[PDB]
Design a protein around this motif. Structure first.
Motif, PDB file in Angstrom:
ATOM      1  N   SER A 116       9.381   4.183  12.380  1.00 54.65           N
ATOM      2  CA  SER A 116       8.489   3.060  12.089  1.00 54.65           C
ATOM      3  C   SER A 116       6.993   3.380  12.167  1.00 54.65           C
ATOM      4  O   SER A 116       6.179   2.576  11.700  1.00 54.65           O
ATOM      5  CB  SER A 116       8.799   1.900  13.024  1.00 54.65           C
ATOM      6  OG  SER A 116       8.477   2.230  14.353  1.00 54.65           O
TER       7      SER A 116
ATOM      8  N   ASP B   4       6.452  -4.469  11.963  1.00 49.98           N
ATOM      9  CA  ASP B   4       7.524  -3.687  11.378  1.00 49.98           C
ATOM     10  C   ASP B   4       8.836  -4.310  11.824  1.00 49.98           C
ATOM     11  O   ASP B   4       8.932  -4.740  12.971  1.00 49.98           O
ATOM     12  CB  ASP B   4       7.455  -2.254  11.862  1.00 49.98           C
ATOM     13  CG  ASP B   4       8.451  -1.386  11.165  1.00 49.98           C
ATOM     14  OD1 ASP B   4       8.162  -0.974  10.014  1.00 49.98           O
ATOM     15  OD2 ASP B   4       9.538  -1.150  11.742  1.00 49.98           O
ATOM     16  N   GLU B  23      12.190  -4.504   3.869  1.00 44.77           N
ATOM     17  CA  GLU B  23      12.209  -3.470   4.898  1.00 44.77           C
ATOM     18  C   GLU B  23      13.623  -3.113   5.302  1.00 44.77           C
ATOM     19  O   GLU B  23      13.911  -1.950   5.583  1.00 44.77           O
ATOM     20  CB  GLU B  23      11.373  -3.892   6.116  1.00 44.77           C
ATOM     21  CG  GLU B  23       9.884  -3.924   5.815  1.00 44.77           C
ATOM     22  CD  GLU B  23       8.974  -3.793   7.021  1.00 44.77           C
ATOM     23  OE1 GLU B  23       9.455  -3.613   8.173  1.00 44.77           O
ATOM     24  OE2 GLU B  23       7.742  -3.880   6.793  1.00 44.77           O
TER      25      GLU B  23
END
Lengths: 150, 150
Positions: A116, B4, B23
């Motif tokens: 990430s 994230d 994602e």
């Protein structure tokens, strides 16, 4: 729908430089370099050479910034801010070298499985490279790809 | 800057359902499942069961759609259009199964190293799941996460 840039060989006027860079850090950061790249990503890859010259080896940077520690991504951002603060007259080549540095840094994180953290490369680019400089980098890449063709 | 989602454990008002799915497909399509996921992705991963029950096994689909062939991505999109045509009235649960189907398909492509095909999952989602349905999916996920906290 925009193209995928992984195996893309051109850099057209309609192609957004920031999107290219987003996809570059995503694919390099998640898949690594054991993958076929198109001519575009292969040109961006050449920026690594500039990075090593301007900022030193990735090994030295890895140790200095403790890149794989819990604070590593924050340490990298701080490092980029220091460069932005200190370089008196920023050139497109400073920005080119900085893209290469982010690329060498994303490798360290990938190898450590800190997947990430590739997001920080984008954070760093937004801090360091304005739209004017993105346009200059784009034109450089276009010229280099034309030269590769011819 | 948005968070994230790889290791993210929540699902808040500001977290956009389409970004989450972008994602999810990126990370699952490029890194696979031998990776630490947060509670959010771990809930989305449960959609695979829905997919298999509604659409059949991945081995059947892989064969039927010749997924790893040159035409595989286009065959997948054609199939998504078929399902949408054959469903009398689309429900949130049809859309959930479809997300699980995309996920199971992206695994096949990752394994074949057709890494850029994950982008077709997004094209499929946009054809099949409107914003009204994304809102409903989000609510369901939020509920399921509360149960996991309790």
């Amino acid at each position: 729908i925009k193209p995928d840039y992984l195996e893309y060989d051109d850099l057209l006027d309609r192609d957004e430089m920031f999107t290219i860079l987003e996809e570059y850090f995503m694919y390099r950061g998640l898949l690594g370099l054991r993958i076929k790249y198109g001519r575009l990503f292969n040109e961006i890859k050449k920026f690594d050479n500039d990075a090593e010259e301007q900022f030193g080896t990735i090994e030295e940077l890895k140790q200095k910034l403790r890149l794989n520690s819990e604070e590593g991504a924050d340490n990298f951002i701080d490092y980029i801010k220091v460069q932005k603060q200190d370089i008196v007259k920023l050139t497109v080549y400073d920005c080119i070298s900085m893209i290469g540095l982010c690329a060498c840094v994303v490798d360290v994180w990938r190898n450590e499985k800190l997947f990430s953290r590739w997001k920080y490369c984008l954070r760093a680019i937004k801090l360091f490279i304005n739209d004017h400089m993105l346009d200059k980098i784009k034109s450089i890449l276009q010229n280099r790809l034309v030269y590769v063709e011819m």
